[model samples]
Target chain A: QDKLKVAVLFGGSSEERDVSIASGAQVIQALRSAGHQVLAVDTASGLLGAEEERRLLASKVKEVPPDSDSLAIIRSSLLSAGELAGVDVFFLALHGGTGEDGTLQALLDAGGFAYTGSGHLASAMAMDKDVAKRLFLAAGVETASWLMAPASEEEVREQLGFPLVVKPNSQGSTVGLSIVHSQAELQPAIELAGRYGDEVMLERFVAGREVTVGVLDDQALPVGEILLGGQEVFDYEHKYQAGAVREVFPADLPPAIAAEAQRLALKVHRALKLSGYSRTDFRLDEQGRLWCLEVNTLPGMTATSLLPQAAAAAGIGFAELCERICRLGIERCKGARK
Target chain B: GQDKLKVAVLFGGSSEERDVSIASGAQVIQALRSAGHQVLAVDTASGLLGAEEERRLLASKVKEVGELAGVDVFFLALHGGTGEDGTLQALLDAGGFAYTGSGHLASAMAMDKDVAKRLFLAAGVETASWLMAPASEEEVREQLGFPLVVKPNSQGSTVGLSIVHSQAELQPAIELAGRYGDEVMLERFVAGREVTVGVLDDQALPVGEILLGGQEVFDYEHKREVFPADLPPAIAAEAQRLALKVHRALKLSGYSRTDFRLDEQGRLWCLEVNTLPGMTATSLLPQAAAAAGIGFAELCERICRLGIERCKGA
Candidate 1:
């Protein structure tokens, strides 16, 4: 609760490295504003000097994600030079790939370091969309039916039908995602998704409102809805570009539907055994059915990101929200050892 | 393949199964040594300790990353701890070291029964029914029935497992299981033969059956197994098929061992998967490999090669 030493870790080998840097920049500012001693740590580059931090933070997101070769260099860096020994808590501002996929969490866990969001196991489970959906179903949360890659054309047509969602089974930020309407497009969509990972997923598209709810320390925040602007899907462009889409915090919805979204989001958090805070995305179909899409262990952490916006809607300011997440991470490390 | 390689075998961590890890580690160190590979037996609790010091430390052991540099492979001879779970794998992965058996994701998922069972169900792998703790006795009985198994969700080797036959025993069983971890699962008791299948290189080996030797419950101390379990051709084939399914469903690599229950109705119910299966002289995985005409030294060599090959692409 008092002033703590926090290391804001971001900018990993993930394709979302640019976004992570931006998120980490804002997180460092908010934590410092909250009166904590903040350290900027780019996991790929290790601890950053003040000047190095400023220049990296000033960089903008590219129209496309980073290529494989550059990310390979980052992946090989391995956070080997960071001064992580005495940090009280690690505020994870990373998204996608090993950063959120449990590899980095595992490294931290092995060292017995306190980190934001979920443990390694829960983090890995949340990153794998197919695994997440299965756990959701078992937890009594509704999700769209899907099939893994190497699926037959006849089976895909018979099981999921037309107008389905095809994407990498373990990716974030809607990278390598496609919405296929006919059989002619299925193979290309599958190949596109496979570019991100070996496992591709074909999910039945649930047409409706795109809503998300954030759960902080076991309590669900108000729901947020994404109003797309002329885009069929909330691809990487609509997600990062400021004017590409309209995001409404505490989304306008009937009381019953909003409450159900909140409830399902909480369920998603617990189902994956995620700690600290997380954001669960869903589709509120025309029939009023809420279909669970995925849970983000380390969602985008810019002040205006979905989780922070929901926190603000719940009367928690960005600075306090960042501090609370740090506290929760420290608390979990203590609890885990117990 | 003929050249000798430096291999570090890590074991004896901070877990309830540390002794079992030591046994497995000793056996592996000997096999790798016999196979003409340079082996470093490092107790994770106490890095690079002597065998004498390792015994004392095992009863209790710093793992230094520097000691593992230049090692061709990290042969993990550990069970039921951070070593077997994703933690050590993640640490090694972070250091860019090739390690035997599954990666962090698969190892972590296989260690957690709740998550593993859900994946099993999704993959159409038949598994027993169960529920998390904090349920009323009436609810558990109505769902999983009277006789059930209460065990810790993630701990290995049946550290806190109990078979409850009536309402009076359920609460105490749950409380006992809570000692190991916060998450406790009450699983339906499937009465029948206990069979296990070992998978290596994505192929299921010969099935093995645990005789149980008249024990009411196969707890930590009881383990009498028969390699190439006696069964009808169809049953053995089905068991092997499901074992491979469980292995792939959990995204395991290198090798694994999946336990199952063969009920009176002749149905196979997947119980759990061990990503880092025990590799002692008589461990199930080695026993299956031996049944398949692979010697212990050859098996150990094969595992090391697999670990190195996996990291070459990384």
Candidate 2:
């Protein structure tokens, strides 16, 4: 493809703002290196310079997600300022809350802008963890059963008993997630998860190895496994820090299991109506059962991000991967209109 | 009407339901005007319409968000198509306009029955048993027995819906529905009372059980009429509760109408939620509201106030 005018958007008014900034910074660098005309648009404060990007990426997510009021203010500003105007395609490097949760995508769709990653409907489905799981079951994919909260004690006991996973129903990077061990721990755990979102989900914890598969365009890349630092769960702390977890691409497994993981990954992508690219996570249980966890419609794009590693293992360089994703996104925008 | 804001009633989209949207839009304009509000009628497809030309314009027109112009709020009386789908909502959301009823996600989800059913289950509401299309005749027979509902997965007003009496009717009905949408929904027909409720804010008003004259369901004829639904005090109360549960499940803000099927067995099953539900003179949402002591003009006024309040919080 020829050098395109791409607006690489990141650092949204969301809990994963910092994560987006880091990923956006790398994407901007890679796209520029790939000989594309790139611009940076930070949804928090719109249209940033190179220096501003570095500072925001170094910041961190707050205990609570950014409320709608502050986000609306920026949304209002962006509309008035015409921040998305004159962009060939918007390369979304955003995550969590307003960014990855489909709010920004909705705004973009409404504005008739071309952006990378899944469209608004699919993005919303992926973010609404509770809704996504239901689709997973209907699609013939096995997932840990869950209860949307404010759930009754009887329902909890009857459905998914003690030793559960509680988290905000629509957050990414495992923000506000807790692994509950017993009955006594659930209430506080749910309350904590509630702080991040309106709906809290209590899922049956699948004890096993953490594995992931990245999908480019529509093809599934090699499966990868994350070896956590003996942590109870892959919490925010473990995710942002270096050396906290060891990630292996084409994760060592029997040929059948590896192929099955890839097959399920592709199924999850289609089931969720995700396009452009995505990453589906699963748990290889003790009994060798693969329980699908969730799919990230807009996965991390940092050079060493899990999805990038998978692409690298498949012989696609980071720059080429970013370039191909941007090209595919442009094609979709044209396809959607037709 | 105390502080009578400038309200724009957006309607008559380029959908199969364009006629219904126009009638609904006219009713909204009249109600709001009677409530002392300054109103403008905008045809999403054909552009803004003059009061005298609105009735004719409603018959047809072309869609977009072209500067709503000093409009305090958009009273969405649009039924089906781009207006009912999240597409319009998304456009207005970016334009930063305040409108009546649910936002983008809820509106879009409610448009697609399959996704809405999943949300219903999450809210602990009971709905008809069904499967997404492409099921074999045997699979359909085994899962959802005869007397099932064959509907285009994502349309309103029963445009491509048919009731199946037996196995012979199932295949042909499914094929008919396939013409309307990529996916079809086969639901076990709930032979029951057609009950519906209106929700304002988080409160559910009195229930209205639709009474169709010699019809198996709320078909095309009854849909056009302003039919009154009668319900016993017990079913009425139960209907309201179920409607409220569905409203919360979809996360709809401002105003919404939820329909249900109160089977002879007395079990309540949600039919669907109307995001931009009809506001025609005979629409169930207004009838249900009227039964709750809120008249048409009052309902229009209240809906605008709620929309304004929602925008403040947004």
Candidate 3:
């Protein structure tokens, strides 16, 4: 493959802004090292210099997402064709917020920008867990039963029993999640999740190990399992801290089950109406049936992220995986337009 | 009189609903004038028009919202086509102009019945089962029964709709619906009373049912009939609440109107949400508002105020 001029867009002020910057940091280095002319663009601010990139990308992950809006200087700047000149593909390093949740994608689509990953509808659907789960059931994919809040405790208990996994319906990284064991903990859990967003979800708690599958160009990668070092739940703390959890690629499972897991993950990607690449999470129940958690449209792409690990286990290196994704995105966009 | 804001009411769109748009803008213009506000009348098709030449100018141009100037707000009396769909909204946003009803995402979602239903179901609102066209006859039979409704997936006001009573009506119905848009919807038609509820400031108004005179299927023409058709207290309350939910589900702000079908089983299935519904004096939205003691003039004034105010948060 030949080198192309690619724009690595990242560092929005979403709650996952830090993680996005972290992912963007790795992607810029990998794509440039692969010989692609990469331009770094922060959504908060338009373009970035080497020193500005270091200052922005070096921040530690924050506890909560920030709400920031640009005059969209970057948007008008794109139309001027000055900053985004000769940019063939926009590799989205953004995780949550308007960047991942279809807002930016809508603008990009309107501007005729051929970017990476899902379009506006799919991006918006993936961001709202409640909506994504509905698509799952519609596609016959088994997902953990859940109810949106403003739901009464008595009603929730009758529908989906105690030990519900309460979380923000529109947030990523389990930022406002709580595993409640009884009705007494329900209100507080709902309030906790409310801090992140107005809508909260109470999902049926599935007792099992965490497993994930990555889909690239419609092909499923090896199944990976997450083993939390000592936590009751794999929340934000475990997600950000290195060695807090162990990720094993090509997770040890019977071949039939492994293939089934991979198949279901791919099904989820399609069910959510996603494009380009995605990562699907699952819970292997005691009965061995996998209950889908959610689909991450722009899944974490750091060196230690689950999707990359799955890809590496499938024998693709970090730079190669980055390059392949960009190519696939360009292909998807052109195919649609033509 | 000086307390009033400058309002630009857009109408006469390029869609089949152009007549309806022109009527809506005229009614809105008269009411705002009566309420002591200055107004700009622009045909999305013919650009700006003098008061006396409005009707003649609407006869030509047929596609535009170009070169708007000196207006406090752009009242989108235009329905269907790019006017009601998000295309116009996106352009407005890019051009830094404030408009009414839903923004780009909400307007786009509301335009597509297929996607709108997904968001509805996710919000726990009931909607009829439906599938995209090009679906096999057997698939349609198994999923949706006889007497199903066929419609152009993205058009408003039941523009290209057909009711299938038997298997024979299935093929032609799909073709008819597909003419308006590439995607067609085969929805299980709920045979029951039809009702509409209007939303303001995120709150739902009193529910108003439609009573079509000598008409079996509710089409573009019959939609103008506002019944004040009575309903069971519980059903009306439920309908109002669902309307509010539908507004949020579509990410709609300012105001919106959601239509529903109340089945014999008393289950309320949302028909669709109109991002830019008809705004006549006796239109369903105004009727619903009137039932809640808000007259047509007050309703028009409130909508304009909300349309301008919500744009600030943009």
Candidate 4:
């Protein structure tokens, strides 16, 4: 009776499709080890057979993300009833696009299914960087200065100045991100980011150490730092391609700074009204002040992912973390129904 | 043959404002039909009931909203509950169906007065101070003070709303508002003229003023509005500007109505933005649009076109 029937949804039509598959593979194994019945379902492809699951999960994240048009064809198949019958919880091993952006969460909620991470509102808000930053500021969380695109060079220079970050407002994993150091590159960077989503944002660059903190079951996890090792941006490659960057859990820092990171992480999570678990990224400037970057409702769930690593540092193994996430999701759903 | 759009008017949700939604949906269906479109009246709670049954449900009271096909756009005449709280919108969005009004995020944000107020403040739109419920009574006294308004953070038609004049009435008021939802809002009651403005396609319609008729609060019992509010031209223009600003700030689309209070000091304090405002033929939004020379049928058609345009581009 304790063994929950958990359907792990992954391989969405997002730019992070490959990464989602990798995370899904690790999550399925961990959930199985934790003694739960695991069913692998792709958001685009629907329920997978044993052979299909093995073949798809075994593939690693490619150097570039896959195109979404082909997957968009069979997207509605998952909505068919009986596909997830008797499932206790939906372990969302998906990232970016509709999977993490509140679309899939809405579908699950409409069907009264318990799912890991935040609900539609929180997921939608966090997926949109512009709205997320506004909520952060409202919740007293400090974020980098930014502006919506279509700003003239004069305005960009006067407001954000050079060495700014340009990217799509609702995308994840720095998929369509660029650093603009000069006026000549500003328009092109904006154009490139605009290719991903209709809304684009230009933010002031915070030249500092990259750090992140995870929140689980309403408590803050350990702070983790990413050592880029000469890589300027932690793009998709540095994020998934192993050994590209070193992630250190319980990041070496003064106790107060670490405590503040955890506190701010909790604040961001509450600010977004997120449940289950979330990972809040920040840029710690040399002055010791943390500038909130963005949040991930469904952070990478690969065994060595930042959230899992933080949970491990806190004495929660990968299997225990997955199981706890499922439990939290089920509880959240129960509370919501009430 | 003329190009006829297949429009689904979704309404009568299981919220306290079910009656209001039904009224809105009835008028919406009439307008769409009047505009030469194939209109389908779908109740979010019951779904596509017969005319007699719809009449029965309305007399008594509301997704029984997603299971349909071959519709050009979903005319969201719904208010409160999942209809306005982003739940149904998310379902329609996930299904890749085009619908009238704001998308899921904006709808959810606007429905939660606390979140909407926060975003308004961030976007430089002035709003009164407030606190979420489970708040300290002492803090409410010091921050918002007595004569504050307590209401459900995500409800429509001002249901469960109470104007408390003393600390003795705070808890009871909070409990009353909590009947609708877990989260309640304690807002500093702005004593001034109650005005509203409707925004569509990035343009704000004429301003509207609710005639409270000496009522302390514009509760669900009394709501009489006058389009093109009797105010100085500059004040009316400013209200229009702020309304448009709120719509864009929330990233809302299709249409929205922002309510505000112009205080004695001439400072306009934004109350809230309704992602899907009341849509009865004579509702505030339609009244404002009428003042701008767009009749009820034309307004409905324009909204449908906007939904279709959004879907085409998306």
Tens digit of per-residue lDDT, candidate 4, span A163-223: 8988788755344567888999998888887774578889999988989999997889999
How does model 3 score by TM-score? Answer: 0.79
Across residues B251-276, which tens digit of lDDT does each residue of candidate 3 receive? 78778889898878899999889888
**Residue pairs with backbone atoms closer than 3 Å in model 4 (clashes):** B44-B63, B45-B63
Cα displacement (angstroms), candidate 1, residue A85, comes to 7.2
Cα RMSD to the true fold for all candidates: 4.3, 5.6, 5.3, 3.6
- Residue pair clashes in candidate 3: A15-A65, B44-B64
- Cα lDDT for residue B286, model 1? 94
TM-score of 2: 0.78
**CA deviation > 4 Å runs, candidate 1:** A44-47, A50-87, A236-240, B1-6, B15-18, B46-70, B215-223
Worst 10 residues of 4 chain B by lDDT: B58-67
Error of 3 at A210 (Å): 1.2
How do all the candidates rank in terms of DockQ, highest first?
4, 1, 2, 3
Best of the two (1, 3) by TM-score: 1
**Candidate 2 chain B — worst ten consecutive residues by lDDT sum?**
B219-228
Per-candidate TM equals 0.89, 0.78, 0.79, 0.91
Question: Against the true structure, what is model 1's DockQ?
Answer: 0.48
TM-score of chain B of each: 0.91, 0.88, 0.89, 0.89
Best by TM-score: 4
